[PDB]
Design an enzyme around this catalytic site. Structure first.
Site, PDB file in Angstrom:
ATOM      1  N   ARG A  74       0.853  -1.203   0.000  1.00  0.00           N
ATOM      2  CA  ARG A  74       0.000   0.000   0.000  1.00  0.00           C
ATOM      3  C   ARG A  74       0.888   1.254   0.000  1.00  0.00           C
ATOM      4  O   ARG A  74       1.718   1.427   0.908  1.00  0.00           O
ATOM      5  CB  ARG A  74      -0.889   0.015   1.259  1.00  0.00           C
ATOM      6  CG  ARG A  74      -1.646   1.347   1.427  1.00  0.00           C
ATOM      7  CD  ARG A  74      -2.611   1.394   2.636  1.00  0.00           C
ATOM      8  NE  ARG A  74      -3.470   2.629   2.598  1.00  0.00           N
ATOM      9  CZ  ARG A  74      -3.547   3.515   3.594  1.00  0.00           C
ATOM     10  NH1 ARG A  74      -2.834   3.347   4.701  1.00  0.00           N
ATOM     11  NH2 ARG A  74      -4.296   4.603   3.491  1.00  0.00           N
ATOM     12  N   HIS A 118      -3.186  11.136   0.474  1.00  0.00           N
ATOM     13  CA  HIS A 118      -2.634  10.909   1.812  1.00  0.00           C
ATOM     14  C   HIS A 118      -2.033  12.269   2.277  1.00  0.00           C
ATOM     15  O   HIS A 118      -0.909  12.330   2.770  1.00  0.00           O
ATOM     16  CB  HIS A 118      -1.628   9.762   1.817  1.00  0.00           C
ATOM     17  CG  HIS A 118      -1.451   9.087   3.165  1.00  0.00           C
ATOM     18  ND1 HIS A 118      -1.023   9.775   4.294  1.00  0.00           N
ATOM     19  CD2 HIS A 118      -1.553   7.785   3.533  1.00  0.00           C
ATOM     20  CE1 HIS A 118      -0.916   8.932   5.313  1.00  0.00           C
ATOM     21  NE2 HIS A 118      -1.235   7.718   4.877  1.00  0.00           N
ATOM     22  N   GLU A 163      -7.802   8.667   6.113  1.00  0.00           N
ATOM     23  CA  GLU A 163      -8.071   9.369   7.375  1.00  0.00           C
ATOM     24  C   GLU A 163      -8.558  10.807   7.191  1.00  0.00           C
ATOM     25  O   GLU A 163      -7.884  11.733   7.646  1.00  0.00           O
ATOM     26  CB  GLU A 163      -6.828   9.362   8.276  1.00  0.00           C
ATOM     27  CG  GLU A 163      -6.315   7.923   8.577  1.00  0.00           C
ATOM     28  CD  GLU A 163      -5.259   7.869   9.671  1.00  0.00           C
ATOM     29  OE1 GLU A 163      -4.697   8.925  10.011  1.00  0.00           O
ATOM     30  OE2 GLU A 163      -4.973   6.770  10.208  1.00  0.00           O
ATOM     31  N   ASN A 290      -7.765   1.883   9.759  1.00  0.00           N
ATOM     32  CA  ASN A 290      -6.472   2.206  10.396  1.00  0.00           C
ATOM     33  C   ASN A 290      -6.724   2.231  11.862  1.00  0.00           C
ATOM     34  O   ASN A 290      -7.701   2.892  12.313  1.00  0.00           O
ATOM     35  CB  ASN A 290      -6.001   3.604   9.959  1.00  0.00           C
ATOM     36  CG  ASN A 290      -5.459   3.630   8.523  1.00  0.00           C
ATOM     37  OD1 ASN A 290      -5.032   4.702   8.027  1.00  0.00           O
ATOM     38  ND2 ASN A 290      -5.485   2.506   7.852  1.00  0.00           N
ATOM     39  N   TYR A 292      -4.465   2.252  15.862  1.00  0.00           N
ATOM     40  CA  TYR A 292      -3.256   2.193  16.671  1.00  0.00           C
ATOM     41  C   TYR A 292      -3.587   2.018  18.178  1.00  0.00           C
ATOM     42  O   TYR A 292      -2.896   1.298  18.912  1.00  0.00           O
ATOM     43  CB  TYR A 292      -2.448   3.504  16.472  1.00  0.00           C
ATOM     44  CG  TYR A 292      -1.908   3.623  15.077  1.00  0.00           C
ATOM     45  CD1 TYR A 292      -0.675   3.057  14.755  1.00  0.00           C
ATOM     46  CD2 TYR A 292      -2.654   4.227  14.059  1.00  0.00           C
ATOM     47  CE1 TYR A 292      -0.160   3.132  13.435  1.00  0.00           C
ATOM     48  CE2 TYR A 292      -2.172   4.284  12.731  1.00  0.00           C
ATOM     49  CZ  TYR A 292      -0.933   3.750  12.430  1.00  0.00           C
ATOM     50  OH  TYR A 292      -0.459   3.862  11.131  1.00  0.00           O
ATOM     51  N   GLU A 347      -3.647   0.139   8.015  1.00  0.00           N
ATOM     52  CA  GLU A 347      -2.488   0.558   8.837  1.00  0.00           C
ATOM     53  C   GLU A 347      -2.689   0.093  10.261  1.00  0.00           C
ATOM     54  O   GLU A 347      -3.768   0.344  10.846  1.00  0.00           O
ATOM     55  CB  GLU A 347      -2.331   2.098   8.932  1.00  0.00           C
ATOM     56  CG  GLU A 347      -2.013   2.756   7.603  1.00  0.00           C
ATOM     57  CD  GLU A 347      -1.832   4.268   7.730  1.00  0.00           C
ATOM     58  OE1 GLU A 347      -1.883   4.930   6.652  1.00  0.00           O
ATOM     59  OE2 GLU A 347      -1.675   4.771   8.902  1.00  0.00           O
TER      60      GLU A 347
HETATM   61  O1  LIG Z   1       1.066   8.406  13.287  1.00  0.00           O
HETATM   62  C1  LIG Z   1       1.291   7.141  12.662  1.00  0.00           C
HETATM   63  C2  LIG Z   1       0.599   7.122  11.295  1.00  0.00           C
HETATM   64  O2  LIG Z   1      -0.780   7.459  11.545  1.00  0.00           O
HETATM   65  C3  LIG Z   1      -1.674   7.239  10.478  1.00  0.00           C
HETATM   66  O3  LIG Z   1      -2.741   8.008  10.963  1.00  0.00           O
HETATM   67  C4  LIG Z   1      -1.221   8.002   9.234  1.00  0.00           C
HETATM   68  O4  LIG Z   1      -2.031   7.623   8.131  1.00  0.00           O
HETATM   69  C5  LIG Z   1       0.282   7.792   8.925  1.00  0.00           C
HETATM   70  O5  LIG Z   1       0.597   8.709   7.868  1.00  0.00           O
HETATM   71  C6  LIG Z   1       1.104   8.069  10.195  1.00  0.00           C
HETATM   72  O6  LIG Z   1       2.527   7.974  10.020  1.00  0.00           O
END
Ligand SMILES: OC[C@H]1O[C@@H](O)[C@H](O)[C@@H](O)[C@@H]1O
Length: 441
Positions: A74, A118, A163, A290, A292, A347
């Site tokens: 990607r 992006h 995003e 995405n 985290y 992601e």
């Molecule tokens: O912060 C970590 C990552 O976050 C994601 O929201 C973004 O798409 C990436 O561009 C970024 O590096």
């Protein structure tokens, strides 16, 4: 244990964060070229001028992808390379680069996934109003058409936006990211035009209808948990969820904005034309997710009556909480709420302090622990009926982490930014085994 036959294991990057060659081969200036010239905006005064120098070194990077056995890769396309200026004429050199990248991927049996936007908006589009202007949805659709006409049957997976929420929040509420505005009341307007641009891009895609290709959008989410079982906290958590996670999903799938959105942005209906909502909610082929970290919220007496409570442990170098159960709940919640549609995790990844040891190995057992837990939670979601088609590690390479500059490393491959030397970390070695085994140990 084992994922489905043909599951698409990948890694992800974005154009501004890795490419460099910021002013070469006719490339135009982007809002991030401009943003990283402003003193104080970026840690260490870093910029994407050079980054991973990927524009020059993509063949080496293509080989690295092959070394890991990626089934898919990607990346994002730098709009300012394709249309450097307000003439809107196509820059053939910029286009040649993505043609060469995609040709190299097929050569190595790697399926391409391209993100059209992006965050690196061309400055000329920004001079015509940027996302405040409705016309930018049409400029985006024209850009889309050019790219799909040229590479449609070479690129089986297309993402319109990455995003859109971050563009709203960081780009317009906080002034942390380009274009750097700090006016909360602009949010709803921007969000609407981001959605509209997606809709018009998808129309252009369906009109071209390239053989064996699909199109979707990537959204970020933070799983919301109330800090206690108290009803005020539960209510703050529910409102935070509606806003944080469904501001985009709701109009995309259902064709309407939710109440929490209309209350946060009372003027929003003023930008909505008679067929916008239908255009916005036309059928996507898949959803990019995405993720985290979760957000833990409590009620507050002061507006807007929600407070995010910071967690101190366990966290990454970003201070983001590590909770794989959060990915599983997000995937289950989307699938229950909106129906079992195809999902790619576009992601997921973590930042830790990485340091080559005396022998030049880069061992990052905390990144391995992050991926172990998260890929395990994804497999549980699949076992529980989520239509997960692929998983992309953020990121293939350590890169330009926006406002943190180079001080944060998300890569499975270490990049020495002085020499441009790449080194597989322990996490890349591990991930290669996952791909070979098509699942965890
Ligand atoms: O912060 C970590 C990552 O976050 C994601 O929201 C973004 O798409 C990436 O561009 C970024 O590096």
């Amino acid at each position: 244990k084992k994922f489905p036959e043909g599951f698409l294991w990948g890694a992800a990057t974005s154009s501004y964060q890795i490419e460099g060659a910021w002013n070469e081969d006719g490339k135009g200036e982007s809002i991030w070229d401009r943003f990283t010239r402003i003193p104080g905006k970026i840690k260490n005064g870093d910029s994407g001028d050079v980054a991973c120098d990927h524009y020059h070194r993509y063949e080496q990077d293509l080989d690295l992808m092959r070394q890991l056995g990626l089934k898919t890769y990607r990346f994002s396309i730098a709009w300012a390379r394709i249309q450097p200026d307000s003439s809107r004429q196509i820059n053939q050199r910029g286009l040649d680069f993505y043609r060469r990248l995609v040709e190299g991927l097929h050569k190595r049996d790697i399926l391409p996934m391209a993100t059209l936007y992006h965050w690196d908006l061309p400055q000329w589009v920004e001079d015509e109003g940027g996302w405040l202007s409705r016309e930018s949805a049409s400029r985006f659709a024209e850009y889309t058409h050019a790219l799909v006409a040229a590479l449609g049957d070479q690129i089986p997976l297309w993402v319109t936006h990455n995003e859109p929420m971050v563009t709203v929040w960081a780009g317009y509420h906080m002034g942390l990211f380009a274009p750097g505005l700090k006016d909360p009341t602009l949010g709803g307007r921007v969000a609407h035009h981001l959605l509209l641009s997606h809709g018009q891009a998808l129309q252009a895609f369906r009109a071209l209808s390239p053989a064996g290709s699909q199109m979707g959008i990537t959204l970020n989410f933070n799983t919301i948990y109330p800090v206690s079982a108290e009803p005020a906290d539960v209510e703050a958590a529910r409102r935070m969820h509606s806003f944080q996670n469904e501001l985009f999903l709701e109009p995309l799938i259902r064709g309407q904005y939710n109440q929490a959105t209309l209350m946060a942005y009372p003027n929003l209906p003023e930008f909505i034309a008679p067929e916008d909502m239908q255009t916005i909610s036309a059928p996507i082929d898949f959803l990019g997710v995405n993720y985290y970290n979760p957000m833990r919220v409590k009620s507050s007496p002061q507006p807007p009556g929600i407070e995010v409570v910071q967690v101190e442990s366990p966290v990454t170098a970003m201070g983001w909480e590590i909770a794989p159960e959060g990915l599983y709940d997000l995937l289950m919640g989307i699938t229950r709420t909106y129906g079992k549609l195809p999902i790619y995790i576009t992601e997921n990844g973590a930042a830790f302090d990485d340091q080559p040891d005396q022998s030049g190995q880069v061992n990052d057992p905390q990144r391995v622990g992050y991926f172990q837990g998260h890929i395990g939670a994804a497999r549980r979601a699949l076992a529980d009926g989520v239509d997960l088609r692929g998983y992309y590690a953020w990121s293939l390479l350590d890169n330009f982490e926006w406002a943190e500059g180079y001080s944060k490393r998300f890569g499975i491959i270490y990049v020495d930014f002085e020499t441009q030397q790449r080194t597989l970390k322990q996490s890349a070695q591990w991930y290669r085994d996952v791909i070979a085994n098509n699942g965890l140990e």
